[PDB]
């Protein structure tokens, strides 16, 4: 990744064994649950395209998901090439060549070119552009991997209300891929059990979740 | 977070993998015991709003508490807008735009903007303001996960007095959001709910006894 | 804590997760054995009062001990307000009251300013003294046995008995009377060998003599 | 490694104990799975030829693979000698670290223009490790066939895991046709019903069952 | 400890939590096996007297050994005093100053970073290691004379127990007098081979001769 | 060890706890498998003689090997004294000075940072590695001549044991012994390949 040194300059630094083992562990233990995505975004803070490909290359299984992520990256690189064409000719002195999509994805660019773009003034943040594409692809994986539907989650008989809300917003997080509403508010009350659903309407309009869960505490 | 450079300048550092894993382990082991909050504040020392959002996003379960946490933050952000409205217009050179509630919460602000606010002269501590709101919502969550009232904490017939006082003040800590409270009534409620053997010894000590004297007396 | 920047400059730093987890693990495993106190002092090296309150606040259990700790802190702060009872000259800082040392009515900026002043006032070191004074009481409380009740078993090795004698003595005292008390409660066999060595014998001589 | 300092200068650091431990534990757990190669490349960031030999020397088992690795390195080194026939430029044995000192390696890596003997040697190592991953792959891609009761996702998992070990981590037309051709007769109908050029997300939403 | 700053000046640093935990673990898993002493010296590299007292204070059990160590420290501080009985003449440390019982950290650093320096931490560590050597010897269970090769014991396992026992009995200080005992206590089959090797054989040759 | 600060100067550093614990755990786990030696050389990067004695002194068991190591060190130090006899000239180290038995830390640093340096730390590490090589060869349970492919053993497993054994003890002679000690089935396939076959070719021809 690109970090700041003691001269106030941005310089390249090798990716650390801890960051690599942390990314491997969250994938082994949590597959593609929605919370994996912010963890990926945090562990790849300051990453170059080479680093992002490194982290993605340490995933041993889930190869169908990885191939989908590649097809998503290829569609974002094609759109980048449409909106930002590369002009022919020699590069102005002290400047970098224009990055095409395959440069941002680290397939046709060198590490030194990635450093050049990311530390230029102004910087062309090819690590952040590529990471947006990867998170777009991973969000589509989180939805495809989600088992139950938000419509399916209905409260049990003797199940406490807080456990039903737990399963509710967890499934909702996988359905929207951690994207954040009276639509989901009315689904919560509708799919409850008859005992609490009666008191929920009696609370009034636009009650807070705190108020709802105090009303169905017992 | 934003840390002191060896030069002495406030500069942005990435959130460390050790910090991320520490917060994940605290939530999975301690759930929402009261001591989780000072651990959250200590692990998020110097955090930007983006870091705070990152720590909350690593929480896998407790999604009910997380939705309730969002609702507390929205109510604090709406209150920040009422007190500090944004003066419309262009921003003077070398200045930052006035932050609104969603900027402090990190939903309509960028990382570069949060860095500018926190390292400005004088600083606008959008990271500290956001953490104050998060702790307010976490206070509610600690009370919700601690259902047992302090009135229902009663020493068992053969329970050691020290274990009874432990359950008493840990229950009192969740109810009172870890706020320091000197109050005679709770100190007499402690003696009121001791078992008959230690209650006899405590009354034979006289009123206004310190906690150390009380625990020494019921050491048997 | 307040640490050493390479420019000889005193800078504030966040408590690391390693220190936080270390102090938590020490209390969970060792409770309040006497060795917890020097571990707290060493883990709080260079601490502002806010840092000390943070370490105390991460303790999950032992809330009876923590309430006792507060009662000692309040009684020590009440004595500081006696011995060191408003305008503030430019460049300088206010004078600290007991609640300022404990970090209840003071900020991190006021604390850092006190501990980096040209005439320094170590509010963290004064606070740490108050905390250790309270941790000592908690260690005496948690010691299950008095030093008088430590007696060598009939078949217990002299080494194992002296281990319990001095571990108890450490918690109680958180000397000739201890030496006479040590030989007086050895089992009868070891006892007369101790009387046979004469007085003024080192512990190394005593333990190698009781080896049989 | 030859890494950036803090005053903007390239200096030589000792290999970190945490790095050596991470490499040893990766080999013990993953053996020679395809993901071992990018892991080796990330942990050898900036390494000199001496550092690379150190990493390979910490491998305890797999001494058959380590000997094939040596034979790949010898082939690359001999080809380097032929392509660079006789500032003294490094020979193949110099790049491999058998005839060069640590000072000569640093002097090559930090010259201007540099001769990156660490990156060259790492290229030969990765080429040798790729032949080992390919050799130790259990199954050919042509024998991956969807089970009658196997969910389509699990079949695509095995297909690309096998293809990664076969092609040694290198959308091809022969693979897109092979994936449809070896699916069970039920999903193979639904796939050809979508038409040509369907995305994998479309093919897995259809045969989601 | 006292460490080097990039400014070239010797600065004081807080003892790290990883160093503290490493020392607590060593004492808990090895007790007073001989190799604990070199691990203690390495973990206390650069230590001040205050740091050395911290490491000793984190030892949980073994309080009989800790009291023995104090008695060794007092004796060395007394001998130091007997061996050490102008405008700007620096006050030199007493035995209690080196041990840290009567000196502040500021005074300790003053001696350690003076020109010329007085390494009170290295002097104190010298006394501690002496007392630790005494504890290692006393804690050694078996005498070197009772180390005998079993009838079906491999020669290498016997030599392992022999030299490990010898290390505790000598506290890791430095002989054909040991080679004689090694040969004499080998079982009859390996002893016949060792005699046939003639005198002056290396250990390497002895273990290769007794492998079958 | 001796590492450089941010002034281009070589400075002394306390050996770290993480390095010490790593070397202790290496000896506990792997004993004296051949890879212990390059692991030692890597963990003692830049070490002084005092730091090398520290690493060896923290080994708990294997005292038979540790005494063998002392006898190897004594032989190398005596040979150094033979090859450097006594005759603003700097005093040069003796064998006991390189081993750290008669030299202080300040003298070891003075040698290692002098211009030009006398690297007593690297010279000592050379002697120690020579001694560890004898130990690894000693601990080697089986001769290379006794590694034979079982009648049901996969050829890859036989080659794994063969080269792991050859590594502990230490080429056309080895390629002969590898083919000679294979079971009669794979030995027929190997001899039918002809000369010049790589190990990759041999393992492919006998993978069945
Ligand atoms: C309302 O104020 C906001 C609103 C958005 C944010 N941002 C920018 C975030 O990234 C927040 C941070 C966050 C996480 C938390 F667990 C609890 C909080 F209080 C805040 N994360 C999510 O939205 C992702 C998420 C978590 N669980 C879900 C359930 C269903 C779903 O569809 C999405 C989610 C901050 C403040
Ligand atoms: C009277 O002296 C004070 C008073 C307040 C403080 N401040 C500023 C704190 O943050 C202290 C730090 C602290 C923690 C500790 F566990 C033991 C100590 F001795 C000090 N935190 C708590 O009090 C929070 C707390 C813990 N358990 C409780 C049970 C019931 C309850 O209602 C609250 C709590 C310092 C000194
Ligand atoms: C005599 O020389 C001295 C005397 C005092 C010190 N100081 C300044 C200390 O802090 C020492 C450091 C220390 C600890 C150790 F376990 C072994 C050592 F050898 C030294 N700690 C204790 O006294 C605390 C202690 C431990 N066990 C006890 C049993 C009974 C008791 O009442 C107290 C204790 C240094 C040198
Ligand atoms: C031919 O190209 C070379 C040749 C030598 C080197 N040097 C300078 C090394 O230090 C190499 C590094 C190495 C290790 C590896 F496991 C695989 C590689 F490909 C390279 N180590 C060994 O030779 C030690 C060794 C490991 N197993 C053995 C089995 C039998 C034996 O007798 C010795 C060994 C580099 C390149
Ligand atoms: C199409 O966009 C690209 C294309 C190539 C890259 N580069 C430069 C890489 O190194 C990528 C990084 C990567 C990994 C990932 F698992 C998922 C992603 F989306 C990206 N690795 C692989 O290609 C190796 C690989 C993994 N599984 C396979 C299955 C079969 C196979 O034959 C090869 C592979 C980046 C972007
Ligand atoms: C002969 O060359 C020397 C001689 C002395 C040294 N010095 C200065 C040491 O500190 C050495 C370092 C050392 C340790 C090692 F395990 C193996 C080595 F080769 C060297 N330590 C010991 O002697 C302590 C020791 C370990 N096991 C023992 C068994 C019986 C016994 O009575 C003592 C010991 C270096 C080189």
**Both tokens assigned to B50:** 């983006």
CA A148/CA A172 separation, integer angstroms: 10
Binding residues of E for ATP: 18
Residue among D189, A88, F69, B11 at smallest CA distance from E204: F69
CA A58/CA A45 separation, integer angstroms: 17
Ramachandran bin of A49, using left for φ above 0, alpha for ψ from -120 to 50, beta for the remaining angles = alpha
Residue of F nearest to E22 (CA): F17
Radius of gyration of chain D (CA): 22
Interface contact C42-E20, CB threshold 8 A: yes
Residue where the block lists tokens 């260079």: C46
Residue of A30, A168, A210 with shortest CB distance to B140 = A210
Residue B150: count of CB within 10 angstroms of its CB: 18
Give the SS3 label for residue F52. helix
Close Cβ partners of A110 (under 8 Å, ≥ 6 residues apart): none
Residue among A134, A148, A167 at smallest CA distance from A36: A134
**Both tokens assigned to A45:** 């803070």
**Both tokens assigned to E200:** 């002056």
- Is some CB atom of chain B closer than 8 A to the CB atom of C6? yes
Interface contact F203-D64, CB threshold 8 A: yes
Counting CB pairs under 8 A, whether chains F and B reach 3 or more, is no
**Residue B109 burial (CB < 10 Å; 0-12/13-18/19+)?**
buried
CA C96/CA C86 separation, integer angstroms: 12
Q: How far apart are the first and last CA of chain E?
A: 52
Sign of CA dihedral C88, C93, C96, C102: positive
Kindly state the helix (H) or strand (E) to which residue A3 belongs, with its residue range: strand A2-4
Kindly state the helix (H) or strand (E) to which residue A201 belongs, with its residue range: helix A194-202
Kindly state the helix (H) or strand (E) to which residue F92 belongs, with its residue range: none
Phi, psi (rounded to 5 degrees) for A3: -120, 175
CA D22 to chain centre: 17
- Is some CB atom of chain C closer than 8 A to the CB atom of E21? yes
**Both tokens assigned to C203:** 């512990």
Kindly state the helix (H) or strand (E) to which residue E118 belongs, with its residue range: none
Q: Give the residues across from B161 on adjacent strands.
A: none
Name which of F39, F133, F136, F144 to mutate to probe chain D: the one with the most chain D Cβ atoms within 10 A of its Cβ: F39
Angle at E50 between CA E46 and CA E51, to 5 degrees: 45
Q: Measuring CA to CA, how many Å separate E7 from each of A207, E115, F6? A: 62, 18, 9
- The yes/no answer on whether domain A2-145 falls in CATH 3.40.50.300 is no
Mutate to test the pocket of ligand 3, among E57, E62, E72, E128 (most ligand atoms within 8 A of CB): E57
Residue among B45, E43, B44, E19 at smallest CA distance from C45: E19
Angle at B173 between CA B172 and CA B175, to 5 degrees: 65
Angle at E184 between CA E181 and CA E186, to 5 degrees: 105
CA C170/CA C176 separation, integer angstroms: 16
CA A23/CA B17 separation, integer angstroms: 9
- Is some CB atom of chain C closer than 8 A to the CB atom of B173? yes
Give the SS3 label for residue D2. strand
Angle at A11 between CA A9 and CA A16, to 5 degrees: 135
- Is residue F51 within 8 Å of residue F120, measured between CB atoms? no
What ligand is nearest to the CA atom of residue F127? 6
Residue E70: count of CB within 10 angstroms of its CB: 15
**Both tokens assigned to E44:** 């206390």
Q: Measuring CA to CA, how many Å separate A197 from each of A154, A157, A201? A: 12, 12, 7
**Residue C78 burial (CB < 10 Å; 0-12/13-18/19+)?**
exposed
Kindly state the helix (H) or strand (E) to which residue D12 belongs, with its residue range: strand D10-12
**Both tokens assigned to D77:** 């080194």
- Is residue B23 within 8 Å of residue B33, measured between CB atoms? no
- Is residue C10 within 8 Å of residue C115, measured between CB atoms? yes
Give the SS3 label for residue F157. helix
Helix axes D17-30, D36-43, angle to 10 degrees: 170
DSSP state of D99: S
Residue B112: count of CB within 10 angstroms of its CB: 8
- Please state which of the four CATH numbers 1.10.375.10, 3.40.50.300, 3.40.220.10, 3.40.50.920 is assigned to the domain occupying F2-139: 1.10.375.10
Ramachandran bin of E19, using left for φ above 0, alpha for ψ from -120 to 50, beta for the remaining angles = alpha
Kindly state the helix (H) or strand (E) to which residue B10 belongs, with its residue range: strand B10-12
Q: Measuring CA to CA, how many Å separate A116 from each of A10, A95, C169? A: 11, 9, 67
B-proximal residues of C, 114-143, CB under 8 Å: 137, 141
Q: How far apart are the first and last CA of chain A?
A: 52
CA F119/CA F113 separation, integer angstroms: 8
CA D151/CA D133 separation, integer angstroms: 27
Phi, psi (rounded to 5 degrees) for B3: -120, 165
Calculate how far, in angstroms, residue C37's C-alpha sits from the geometric centre of ligand 3.
13
Mutate to test the pocket of ligand 2, among B170, B178, B182 (most ligand atoms within 8 A of CB): B178
Residue among A149, A148, A133 at smallest CA distance from A75: A133
Radius of gyration of chain F (CA): 23
- Is residue A37 within 8 Å of residue A67, measured between CB atoms? no
**Both tokens assigned to D78:** 């001999």
The full length of chain F comes to: 208
DSSP state of D45: T
Is the Cβ atom of C135 under 6 angstroms away from ligand 2? Answer: no
Residue D174: count of CB within 10 angstroms of its CB: 8
**Both tokens assigned to D112:** 């201007």
3-state SS of chain C?
A: CEEECCCCCEEECCCCHHHHHHHHHHHHHHCCCCCHHHHHHHHCCCCCHHHHHHHHHCCCCCHHHHHHHHHHHHHHHHHHHHHCCCCCCCCCCCCCCHHHHCCCCCCHHHHHHHHCCCCCCCHHHHHHHHHHHHHHHHHHHHCCCCCCCCCCCCCCCHHHHHHHHHHHHHHHCCCHHHHHHHHHCCCHHHHHHHHHCCCCCCHHHHHHHCCC
Angle at B108 between CA B102 and CA B112, to 5 degrees: 115
DSSP state of D79: H
Interface contact C68-B212, CB threshold 8 A: yes
- Is residue A52 within 8 Å of residue A131, measured between CB atoms? yes
Kindly state the helix (H) or strand (E) to which residue B220 belongs, with its residue range: none
DSSP state of B99: P
CA A41/CA A218 separation, integer angstroms: 40
CA B66/CA B82 separation, integer angstroms: 25
Interface contact B68-A19, CB threshold 8 A: no
CA F160 to chain centre: 20
Residue among C90, C4, C99, C115 at smallest CA distance from C53: C99
CA D28/CA C159 separation, integer angstroms: 45
- Is some CB atom of chain B closer than 8 A to the CB atom of A208? yes
Ligand 5, atom 19, lies closest to the CA of A70
Residue of D nearest to F200 (CA): D68
Kindly state the helix (H) or strand (E) to which residue A216 belongs, with its residue range: none
- Is residue D117 within 8 Å of residue D90, measured between CB atoms? yes
CA C202/CA B219 separation, integer angstroms: 36
Residue of D59, D66, D71 with shortest CB distance to F198 = D71
Sign of CA dihedral E184, E188, E192, E194: negative
How many Cα atoms occupy the beta-carbon half-sphere of F208 within 13 Å?
A: 7
Q: What is the DSSP string of chain F?
A: -EEE-TTS-EEE-PPPHHHHHHHHHHHHHHTT-TTHHHHHHHHTTT--HHHHHHHHHT--S-HHHHHHHHHHHHHHHHHHHHHS----PPPPP-HHHHTTSS--HHHHHHHHHSSS---HHHHHHHHHHHHHHHHHHHH--S-GGG----TT--HHHHHHHHHHHHHHH--HHHHHHHHHTS-HHHHHHHHHH-TT--HHHHHHHT--
- Is residue C26 within 8 Å of residue C39, measured between CB atoms? yes
DSSP state of D143: G
Q: What is the DSSP string of E142-159?
A: S-GGG----TT--HHHHH
**To one decimal place, what's the resolution in Å?**
2.4
CA E10/CA E12 separation, integer angstroms: 7
**Both tokens assigned to F68:** 């063998």
CA B119/CA B94 separation, integer angstroms: 12
Q: Give the residues across from B4 on adjacent strands.
A: B10
CA F40/CA F19 separation, integer angstroms: 10
Ligand 6, atom 24, lies closest to the CA of E172
Q: Give the residues across from A2 on adjacent strands.
A: A12
| Cis-peptide into A8, omega within 30 deg | no
Mutate to test the pocket of ligand 5, among A23, A53, A106, A133 (most ligand atoms within 8 A of CB): A53
Mind telling me how many Å the CA of F44 is from chain E's nearest CA?
14
Residue among E95, F199, D49, A169 at smallest CA distance from B66: A169
- Is residue F140 within 8 Å of residue F132, measured between CB atoms? no
The full length of chain C comes to: 212
- Is residue C136 within 8 Å of residue C26, measured between CB atoms? no
The full length of chain E comes to: 212
- Is some CB atom of chain A closer than 8 A to the CB atom of B67? yes
- Per DSSP, helices labelled H in chain B are 17-30, 36-43, 49-57, 63-83, 101-104, 111-118, 126-145, 161-175, 184-192, 196-203, 211-217
Sign of CA dihedral B206, B207, B213, B218: positive
**Residue F18 burial (CB < 10 Å; 0-12/13-18/19+)?**
middle
Close Cβ partners of C192 (under 8 Å, ≥ 6 residues apart): none
Structure obtained using: X-ray
Mind telling me how many Å the CA of C172 is from chain E's nearest CA?
14
| Cis-peptide into E116, omega within 30 deg | yes
CA F28/CA F30 separation, integer angstroms: 6
Q: Pairing relation of β-strands C2-4 and B10-12?
A: unpaired
DSSP state of F144: G
- Per DSSP, helices labelled H in chain E are 17-30, 36-43, 49-57, 63-83, 95-99, 105-112, 120-139, 155-170, 176-184, 188-196, 203-209
Close Cβ partners of B62 (under 8 Å, ≥ 6 residues apart): A166, B27, B31, B32, B141
- The yes/no answer on whether domain C2-142 falls in CATH 1.10.375.10 is yes
- Is residue B173 within 8 Å of residue B134, measured between CB atoms? no
CA A102/CA A96 separation, integer angstroms: 15
Residue F117: count of CB within 10 angstroms of its CB: 14
Q: How far apart are the first and last CA of chain C?
A: 52
Interface contact F71-E167, CB threshold 8 A: no
CA C98/CA A50 separation, integer angstroms: 56
CA E62/CA C165 separation, integer angstroms: 11
Give the SS3 label for residue F154. coil
Q: Which CATH superfamily is domain D2-136 in?
A: Human Immunodeficiency Virus Type 1 Capsid Protein (1.10.375.10)
Close Cβ partners of E117 (under 8 Å, ≥ 6 residues apart): E111
CA B69/CA A208 separation, integer angstroms: 11
Instruction: Using an 8 Å CB-CB cutoff, list chain A residues near D42.
Output: 14-15, 20, 54, 58
Kindly state the helix (H) or strand (E) to which residue F2 belongs, with its residue range: strand F2-4
CA F128/CA F126 separation, integer angstroms: 5
Q: Measuring CA to CA, how many Å separate A130 from each of A111, A126, B13, D38, D196? A: 14, 6, 20, 19, 28
Residue of B7, B15, B71 with shortest CB distance to A209 = B71
CA D102/CA A15 separation, integer angstroms: 24
Residue F192: count of CB within 10 angstroms of its CB: 9
Radius of gyration of chain B (CA): 23
Kindly state the helix (H) or strand (E) to which residue A11 belongs, with its residue range: strand A10-12
């Amino acid at each position: 990744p690109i970090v700041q040194n003691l001269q106030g300059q941005m310089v390249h630094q090798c990716i650390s064994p801890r960051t690599l083992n942390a990314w491997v562990k969250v994938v082994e233990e949590k597959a593609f649950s929605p919370e994996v995505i912010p963890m990926f975004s945090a562990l790849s803070c300051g990453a170059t395209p080479q680093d992002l490909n490194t982290m993605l290359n340490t995933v041993g299984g889930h190869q169908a998901a990885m191939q989908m992520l590649k097809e998503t990256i290829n569609e974002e690189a094609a759109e980048w090439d449409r909106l930002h064409p590369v002009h022919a000719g020699p590069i102005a002195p002290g400047q970098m060549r224009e990055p095409r999509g395959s440069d941002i994805a680290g397939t046709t660019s060198t590490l030194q070119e990635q450093i050049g773009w990311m530390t230029h003034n102004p910087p062309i943040p090819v690590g952040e552009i590529y990471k947006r594409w990867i998170i777009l692809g991973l969000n589509k994986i989180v939805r495809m991997y989600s088992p139950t539907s938000i419509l399916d989650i209905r409260q049990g008989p003797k199940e406490p209300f807080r456990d039903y809300v737990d399963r509710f917003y967890k499934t909702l997080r996988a359905e929207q891929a951690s994207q954040e509403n009276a639509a989901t508010e009315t689904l919560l009350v509708q799919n409850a059990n008859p005992d609490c659903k009666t008191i929920l309407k009696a609370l009034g309009p636009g009650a807070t979740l705190e108020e709802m869960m105090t009303a169905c505490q017992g």
